[PDB]
mmCIF file of C-alpha atoms and ligand atoms in Angstrom:
data_model
loop_
_atom_site.group_PDB
_atom_site.id
_atom_site.type_symbol
_atom_site.label_atom_id
_atom_site.label_comp_id
_atom_site.label_asym_id
_atom_site.label_seq_id
_atom_site.Cartn_x
_atom_site.Cartn_y
_atom_site.Cartn_z
ATOM 1 C CA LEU A 1 0.475 0.239 -0.342
ATOM 2 C CA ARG A 2 1.009 3.642 -1.202
ATOM 3 C CA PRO A 3 -0.775 6.072 1.880
ATOM 4 C CA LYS A 4 0.388 9.609 -0.052
ATOM 5 C CA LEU A 5 1.195 11.607 3.026
ATOM 6 C CA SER A 6 -1.301 13.461 4.931
ATOM 7 C CA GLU A 7 -1.556 18.269 5.100
ATOM 8 C CA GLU A 8 1.347 17.865 7.832
ATOM 9 C CA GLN A 9 3.976 15.367 6.877
ATOM 10 C CA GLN A 10 3.300 18.053 3.001
ATOM 11 C CA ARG A 11 3.824 21.128 5.280
ATOM 12 C CA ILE A 12 6.695 19.340 7.580
ATOM 13 C CA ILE A 13 8.662 18.179 4.170
ATOM 14 C CA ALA A 14 8.894 21.867 3.324
ATOM 15 C CA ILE A 15 9.784 23.669 6.691
ATOM 16 C CA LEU A 16 12.619 20.695 6.893
ATOM 17 C CA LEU A 17 13.297 21.887 3.261
ATOM 18 C CA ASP A 18 13.356 25.644 4.519
ATOM 19 C CA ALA A 19 15.462 24.592 7.514
ATOM 20 C CA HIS A 20 17.687 22.963 4.685
ATOM 21 C CA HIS A 21 18.288 26.038 2.473
ATOM 22 C CA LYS A 22 18.399 28.433 5.539
ATOM 23 C CA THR A 23 21.268 26.836 7.047
ATOM 24 C CA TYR A 24 22.733 25.048 4.042
ATOM 25 C CA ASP A 25 25.742 27.456 2.142
ATOM 26 C CA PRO A 26 26.381 24.944 -1.391
ATOM 27 C CA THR A 27 29.161 28.097 -2.143
ATOM 28 C CA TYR A 28 30.837 27.990 1.054
ATOM 29 C CA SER A 29 31.087 31.467 1.048
ATOM 30 C CA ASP A 30 31.894 31.532 5.178
ATOM 31 C CA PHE A 31 34.437 29.517 4.549
ATOM 32 C CA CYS A 32 38.047 32.329 3.719
ATOM 33 C CA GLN A 33 36.929 33.966 7.916
ATOM 34 C CA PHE A 34 38.272 30.034 9.219
ATOM 35 C CA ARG A 35 41.673 30.270 9.928
ATOM 36 C CA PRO A 36 43.975 29.267 7.621
ATOM 37 C CA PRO A 37 44.339 25.583 6.683
ATOM 38 C CA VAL A 38 47.943 24.757 7.628
ATOM 39 C CA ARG A 39 49.426 21.277 5.372
ATOM 40 C CA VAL A 40 53.106 20.071 6.649
ATOM 41 C CA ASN A 41 54.766 17.528 5.103
ATOM 42 C CA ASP A 42 53.490 14.142 6.317
ATOM 43 C CA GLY A 43 53.992 11.129 3.368
ATOM 44 C CA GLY A 44 54.396 8.254 5.654
ATOM 45 C CA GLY A 45 51.431 9.516 8.522
ATOM 46 C CA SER A 46 54.237 9.864 11.187
ATOM 47 C CA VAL A 47 51.006 9.749 14.345
ATOM 48 C CA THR A 48 54.497 12.011 15.935
ATOM 49 C CA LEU A 49 55.263 14.854 13.496
ATOM 50 C CA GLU A 50 50.620 14.801 13.327
ATOM 51 C CA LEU A 51 50.591 15.581 17.113
ATOM 52 C CA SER A 52 53.214 18.066 17.506
ATOM 53 C CA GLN A 53 51.544 20.259 14.375
ATOM 54 C CA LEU A 54 48.035 19.341 14.773
ATOM 55 C CA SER A 55 49.136 21.634 11.167
ATOM 56 C CA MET A 56 45.110 21.291 10.514
ATOM 57 C CA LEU A 57 43.447 21.418 13.988
ATOM 58 C CA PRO A 58 42.368 25.582 14.037
ATOM 59 C CA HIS A 59 40.746 25.133 10.347
ATOM 60 C CA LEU A 60 39.162 21.951 10.382
ATOM 61 C CA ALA A 61 38.091 22.935 14.390
ATOM 62 C CA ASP A 62 36.313 26.428 13.143
ATOM 63 C CA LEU A 63 35.169 24.202 10.292
ATOM 64 C CA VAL A 64 33.276 22.159 12.650
ATOM 65 C CA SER A 65 32.627 24.674 14.776
ATOM 66 C CA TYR A 66 30.797 26.244 12.509
ATOM 67 C CA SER A 67 28.289 23.571 11.162
ATOM 68 C CA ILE A 68 26.967 23.033 14.681
ATOM 69 C CA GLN A 69 25.680 26.385 14.471
ATOM 70 C CA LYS A 70 24.318 25.255 11.464
ATOM 71 C CA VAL A 71 23.019 22.134 12.951
ATOM 72 C CA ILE A 72 21.960 24.586 15.896
ATOM 73 C CA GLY A 73 19.758 26.100 13.808
ATOM 74 C CA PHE A 74 18.475 23.283 11.227
ATOM 75 C CA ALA A 75 17.160 21.965 14.779
ATOM 76 C CA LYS A 76 15.402 24.623 16.161
ATOM 77 C CA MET A 77 13.144 24.429 12.921
ATOM 78 C CA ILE A 78 12.266 20.664 12.817
ATOM 79 C CA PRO A 79 8.801 20.498 14.632
ATOM 80 C CA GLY A 80 8.403 19.512 17.701
ATOM 81 C CA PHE A 81 11.898 20.548 18.787
ATOM 82 C CA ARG A 82 10.748 22.846 20.624
ATOM 83 C CA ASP A 83 8.150 21.366 22.751
ATOM 84 C CA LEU A 84 11.435 19.317 24.127
ATOM 85 C CA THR A 85 12.609 20.941 27.317
ATOM 86 C CA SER A 86 15.835 23.542 27.261
ATOM 87 C CA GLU A 87 17.822 20.359 28.856
ATOM 88 C CA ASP A 88 16.370 18.076 25.793
ATOM 89 C CA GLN A 89 16.792 20.156 23.740
ATOM 90 C CA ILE A 90 21.329 20.644 24.687
ATOM 91 C CA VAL A 91 21.194 16.729 25.240
ATOM 92 C CA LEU A 92 19.944 15.691 22.032
ATOM 93 C CA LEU A 93 22.306 18.701 20.082
ATOM 94 C CA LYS A 94 25.494 17.641 21.801
ATOM 95 C CA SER A 95 24.760 13.719 22.113
ATOM 96 C CA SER A 96 24.451 13.853 17.614
ATOM 97 C CA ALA A 97 26.443 17.077 16.501
ATOM 98 C CA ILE A 98 29.147 14.469 14.774
ATOM 99 C CA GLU A 99 27.039 12.736 13.589
ATOM 100 C CA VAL A 100 24.337 14.773 11.776
ATOM 101 C CA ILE A 101 27.991 16.717 10.435
ATOM 102 C CA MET A 102 28.406 13.727 8.587
ATOM 103 C CA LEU A 103 25.571 13.696 7.482
ATOM 104 C CA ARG A 104 25.140 16.913 6.091
ATOM 105 C CA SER A 105 29.284 16.836 5.146
ATOM 106 C CA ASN A 106 28.160 14.315 2.406
ATOM 107 C CA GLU A 107 26.187 16.936 0.201
ATOM 108 C CA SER A 108 30.142 18.585 -0.401
ATOM 109 C CA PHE A 109 31.365 14.617 -0.869
ATOM 110 C CA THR A 110 33.100 14.336 -3.870
ATOM 111 C CA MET A 111 32.636 9.970 -5.628
ATOM 112 C CA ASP A 112 34.912 11.566 -8.698
ATOM 113 C CA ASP A 113 38.396 12.048 -6.380
ATOM 114 C CA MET A 114 37.319 10.742 -1.903
ATOM 115 C CA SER A 115 37.180 14.673 -0.887
ATOM 116 C CA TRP A 116 35.097 16.783 0.894
ATOM 117 C CA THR A 117 35.300 20.749 -2.448
ATOM 118 C CA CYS A 118 34.118 23.302 -0.743
ATOM 119 C CA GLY A 119 35.276 25.562 -3.565
ATOM 120 C CA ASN A 120 38.584 25.698 -4.001
ATOM 121 C CA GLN A 121 41.720 23.306 -3.028
ATOM 122 C CA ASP A 122 42.718 25.159 -0.197
ATOM 123 C CA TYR A 123 38.705 24.032 1.369
ATOM 124 C CA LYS A 124 39.035 20.526 -1.016
ATOM 125 C CA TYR A 125 39.729 17.600 2.255
ATOM 126 C CA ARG A 126 40.830 14.426 1.892
ATOM 127 C CA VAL A 127 41.568 11.601 4.346
ATOM 128 C CA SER A 128 45.585 13.236 4.753
ATOM 129 C CA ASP A 129 43.460 16.387 6.424
ATOM 130 C CA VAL A 130 41.893 14.603 8.954
ATOM 131 C CA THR A 131 44.896 12.639 10.037
ATOM 132 C CA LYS A 132 46.877 16.253 9.834
ATOM 133 C CA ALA A 133 44.274 16.951 12.519
ATOM 134 C CA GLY A 134 45.092 14.092 14.901
ATOM 135 C CA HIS A 135 42.298 11.913 14.316
ATOM 136 C CA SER A 136 43.764 8.022 13.064
ATOM 137 C CA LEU A 137 42.779 5.425 10.439
ATOM 138 C CA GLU A 138 40.711 3.706 13.108
ATOM 139 C CA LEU A 139 38.019 6.929 12.068
ATOM 140 C CA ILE A 140 38.507 8.148 8.276
ATOM 141 C CA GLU A 141 38.436 4.340 6.790
ATOM 142 C CA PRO A 142 35.107 3.785 8.761
ATOM 143 C CA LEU A 143 34.261 7.130 7.952
ATOM 144 C CA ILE A 144 34.668 8.030 3.622
ATOM 145 C CA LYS A 145 33.264 3.820 3.497
ATOM 146 C CA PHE A 146 29.882 5.668 5.341
ATOM 147 C CA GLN A 147 30.735 8.525 2.696
ATOM 148 C CA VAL A 148 30.873 6.483 -0.620
ATOM 149 C CA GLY A 149 27.380 4.187 1.209
ATOM 150 C CA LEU A 150 25.365 7.120 1.147
ATOM 151 C CA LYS A 151 26.231 9.543 -1.707
ATOM 152 C CA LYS A 152 25.425 5.318 -3.179
ATOM 153 C CA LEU A 153 21.467 6.320 -1.949
ATOM 154 C CA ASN A 154 21.153 8.950 -4.535
ATOM 155 C CA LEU A 155 19.131 10.658 -1.873
ATOM 156 C CA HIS A 156 16.767 13.430 -2.571
ATOM 157 C CA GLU A 157 16.936 17.235 -0.132
ATOM 158 C CA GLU A 158 13.612 15.286 1.384
ATOM 159 C CA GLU A 159 15.553 12.104 2.183
ATOM 160 C CA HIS A 160 18.232 14.028 3.711
ATOM 161 C CA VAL A 161 17.075 17.160 5.393
ATOM 162 C CA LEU A 162 14.544 14.355 7.323
ATOM 163 C CA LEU A 163 17.398 11.692 7.571
ATOM 164 C CA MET A 164 19.636 14.247 9.423
ATOM 165 C CA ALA A 165 16.180 15.867 11.473
ATOM 166 C CA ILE A 166 15.456 11.229 12.623
ATOM 167 C CA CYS A 167 19.043 11.333 13.625
ATOM 168 C CA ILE A 168 18.663 14.890 16.098
ATOM 169 C CA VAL A 169 15.593 14.039 17.712
ATOM 170 C CA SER A 170 16.704 10.458 19.092
ATOM 171 C CA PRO A 171 14.926 9.023 22.157
ATOM 172 C CA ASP A 172 18.326 6.390 23.204
ATOM 173 C CA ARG A 173 20.656 9.060 24.019
ATOM 174 C CA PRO A 174 22.435 9.600 26.988
ATOM 175 C CA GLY A 175 20.678 11.814 29.834
ATOM 176 C CA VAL A 176 17.122 12.392 28.498
ATOM 177 C CA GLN A 177 14.899 13.169 30.562
ATOM 178 C CA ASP A 178 11.777 13.245 28.145
ATOM 179 C CA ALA A 179 12.710 9.667 25.656
ATOM 180 C CA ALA A 180 8.533 9.053 25.184
ATOM 181 C CA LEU A 181 7.751 13.198 23.811
ATOM 182 C CA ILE A 182 11.738 12.543 21.808
ATOM 183 C CA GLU A 183 10.300 9.404 20.300
ATOM 184 C CA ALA A 184 6.394 10.612 18.823
ATOM 185 C CA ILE A 185 8.189 13.988 17.753
ATOM 186 C CA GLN A 186 10.755 11.407 15.941
ATOM 187 C CA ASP A 187 7.907 8.219 14.396
ATOM 188 C CA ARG A 188 6.793 11.783 13.422
ATOM 189 C CA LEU A 189 9.747 12.451 10.817
ATOM 190 C CA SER A 190 9.809 8.368 10.461
ATOM 191 C CA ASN A 191 5.742 8.677 9.109
ATOM 192 C CA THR A 192 7.058 10.812 7.027
ATOM 193 C CA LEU A 193 9.441 9.389 5.117
ATOM 194 C CA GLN A 194 8.711 6.266 4.865
ATOM 195 C CA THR A 195 5.955 6.999 3.262
ATOM 196 C CA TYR A 196 8.178 10.005 0.868
ATOM 197 C CA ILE A 197 9.609 7.215 -0.053
ATOM 198 C CA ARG A 198 7.127 4.518 -1.548
ATOM 199 C CA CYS A 199 4.719 7.659 -2.434
ATOM 200 C CA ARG A 200 8.602 9.420 -4.787
ATOM 201 C CA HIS A 201 10.485 7.598 -4.455
ATOM 202 C CA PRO A 202 10.816 5.810 -7.396
ATOM 203 C CA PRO A 203 12.147 1.737 -8.604
ATOM 204 C CA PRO A 204 15.115 0.675 -8.578
ATOM 205 C CA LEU A 205 14.751 -1.223 0.878
ATOM 206 C CA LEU A 206 15.788 2.629 0.892
ATOM 207 C CA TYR A 207 14.233 3.088 4.117
ATOM 208 C CA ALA A 208 16.056 0.393 5.884
ATOM 209 C CA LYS A 209 19.138 1.219 3.840
ATOM 210 C CA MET A 210 18.950 4.820 5.250
ATOM 211 C CA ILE A 211 18.097 3.339 8.791
ATOM 212 C CA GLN A 212 20.890 1.291 8.511
ATOM 213 C CA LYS A 213 23.024 4.423 7.851
ATOM 214 C CA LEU A 214 21.621 5.796 11.701
ATOM 215 C CA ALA A 215 22.932 2.669 12.818
ATOM 216 C CA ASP A 216 26.864 3.453 11.323
ATOM 217 C CA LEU A 217 27.139 7.340 12.777
ATOM 218 C CA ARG A 218 26.235 5.438 16.168
ATOM 219 C CA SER A 219 30.338 2.945 16.116
ATOM 220 C CA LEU A 220 31.205 6.695 14.193
ATOM 221 C CA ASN A 221 30.202 9.059 16.543
ATOM 222 C CA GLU A 222 32.360 6.406 19.480
ATOM 223 C CA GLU A 223 35.086 6.195 17.735
ATOM 224 C CA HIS A 224 35.235 10.802 17.308
ATOM 225 C CA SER A 225 34.944 10.479 21.127
ATOM 226 C CA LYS A 226 37.004 7.747 21.630
ATOM 227 C CA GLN A 227 39.707 10.035 19.407
ATOM 228 C CA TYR A 228 38.388 13.271 20.337
ATOM 229 C CA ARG A 229 39.583 12.543 24.184
ATOM 230 C CA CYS A 230 42.907 11.026 23.207
ATOM 231 C CA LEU A 231 43.815 14.934 21.142
ATOM 232 C CA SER A 232 42.882 16.866 24.327
ATOM 233 C CA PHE A 233 45.344 14.988 25.694
ATOM 234 C CA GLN A 234 48.142 17.009 23.238
ATOM 235 C CA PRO A 235 49.395 20.026 24.732
ATOM 236 C CA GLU A 236 48.177 23.526 23.675
ATOM 237 C CA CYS A 237 45.146 21.411 21.614
ATOM 238 C CA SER A 238 42.513 24.166 23.173
ATOM 239 C CA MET A 239 43.751 27.443 21.894
ATOM 240 C CA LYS A 240 43.841 25.221 18.390
ATOM 241 C CA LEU A 241 39.637 24.671 19.004
ATOM 242 C CA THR A 242 36.882 26.410 19.632
ATOM 243 C CA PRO A 243 34.723 26.955 22.794
ATOM 244 C CA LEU A 244 31.724 25.237 20.849
ATOM 245 C CA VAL A 245 33.719 22.253 20.005
ATOM 246 C CA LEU A 246 34.950 22.034 23.895
ATOM 247 C CA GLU A 247 32.200 22.275 24.929
ATOM 248 C CA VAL A 248 30.632 19.853 22.534
ATOM 249 C CA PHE A 249 32.804 17.104 22.783
ATOM 250 C CA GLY A 250 34.670 17.565 26.817
HETATM 251 C C1 DS5 B 301 32.491 14.524 8.237
HETATM 252 C C2 DS5 B 301 34.339 15.203 7.459
HETATM 253 C C3 DS5 B 301 35.723 16.247 7.285
HETATM 254 C C4 DS5 B 301 36.269 16.040 6.416
HETATM 255 C C5 DS5 B 301 37.632 16.927 6.740
HETATM 256 C C6 DS5 B 301 35.623 16.654 9.362
HETATM 257 C C7 DS5 B 301 36.367 17.615 9.611
HETATM 258 C C8 DS5 B 301 36.154 18.041 11.024
HETATM 259 C C9 DS5 B 301 36.745 16.565 11.784
HETATM 260 C C10 DS5 B 301 37.152 16.803 13.285
HETATM 261 C C11 DS5 B 301 37.333 16.672 13.872
HETATM 262 C C12 DS5 B 301 37.394 17.179 16.125
HETATM 263 O O1 DS5 B 301 37.412 16.209 16.153
HETATM 264 C C13 DS5 B 301 35.730 18.061 15.943
HETATM 265 F F1 DS5 B 301 35.991 18.637 17.845
HETATM 266 F F2 DS5 B 301 36.136 19.468 15.745
HETATM 267 F F3 DS5 B 301 34.997 17.152 15.758
HETATM 268 C C14 DS5 B 301 39.282 18.036 16.176
HETATM 269 F F4 DS5 B 301 38.446 19.568 15.038
HETATM 270 F F5 DS5 B 301 38.644 18.573 17.264
HETATM 271 F F6 DS5 B 301 40.195 17.585 15.419
HETATM 272 C C15 DS5 B 301 36.603 15.595 11.354
HETATM 273 C C16 DS5 B 301 36.530 13.981 11.928
HETATM 274 C C17 DS5 B 301 36.344 15.615 9.668
HETATM 275 C C18 DS5 B 301 33.924 18.013 7.364
HETATM 276 C C19 DS5 B 301 34.050 17.346 6.153
HETATM 277 C C20 DS5 B 301 32.876 18.766 5.536
HETATM 278 C C21 DS5 B 301 32.793 19.481 6.087
HETATM 279 O O2 DS5 B 301 31.173 20.983 6.452
HETATM 280 C C22 DS5 B 301 31.325 20.829 4.882
HETATM 281 C C23 DS5 B 301 29.613 21.441 5.577
HETATM 282 O O3 DS5 B 301 28.759 20.821 5.163
HETATM 283 C C24 DS5 B 301 29.670 22.819 5.914
HETATM 284 C C25 DS5 B 301 28.550 24.190 5.576
HETATM 285 C C26 DS5 B 301 27.511 23.009 6.993
HETATM 286 O O4 DS5 B 301 27.888 22.253 6.914
HETATM 287 O O5 DS5 B 301 26.336 24.508 7.587
HETATM 288 C C27 DS5 B 301 32.495 18.855 7.949
HETATM 289 C C28 DS5 B 301 31.474 19.769 9.188
HETATM 290 C C29 DS5 B 301 33.444 18.465 8.241
#
């Protein structure tokens, strides 16, 4: 059966598309405002050298910090998100931050050369840039696999925005107080997505594949958190970060 999207479900999609258009700049025009990228000679991928220099850390921390601000803006526009307590909204934003960043980064990701192409050569990011910021192969390898897997689903913008919204409004995050209300908001979004796929996505199992991506995001989040913790042990690391990044990941 293919039930049609309700007036409410069509309204939810319009709100989320509008929210994304207002919080995502596909021209990457603010990137010149970040601390500049610096790429040291590191053909060997030396952990000692990367930790001593952390050459890409100020630029990558400014990029993630900027993206978190956009994610906070997007979340405020999710139907029902404002119905949650400020404590729950913050727990949800903090626990989902890195996952939503990985999802939204997919728009700039290109399978042409396996990079995140955000304008000129200075804003073209590869595996080596993330290692130059103190991260390791245990994070970057599955991150690239995830980006390809997601790119290959060829999501409609409607599906991409619904997926980010479902990711954020997750009742299974440590520290949430009103899990039942969060689940009700997520179910309203999940039902919109399942209905949309059946009614608007042409052939040639997409909903199941999108849910699997949300599970992959949990493992990437756990690895990112372990690696951030290591990176934070580097003397003088905090100046290379931002207050928002320090709060979200600290
Ligand atoms: C996910 C892939 C990548 C690859 C370079 C990325 C970057 C930085 C980090 C980090 C880190 C930190 O641990 C911390 F703490 F910051 F998390 C560190 F800094 F400490 F190292 C990681 C793990 C991955 C990336 C590429 C394009 C991006 O935005 C493109 C547009 O999406 C922007 C516009 C928008 O989003 O509106 C974004 C956001 C991120």
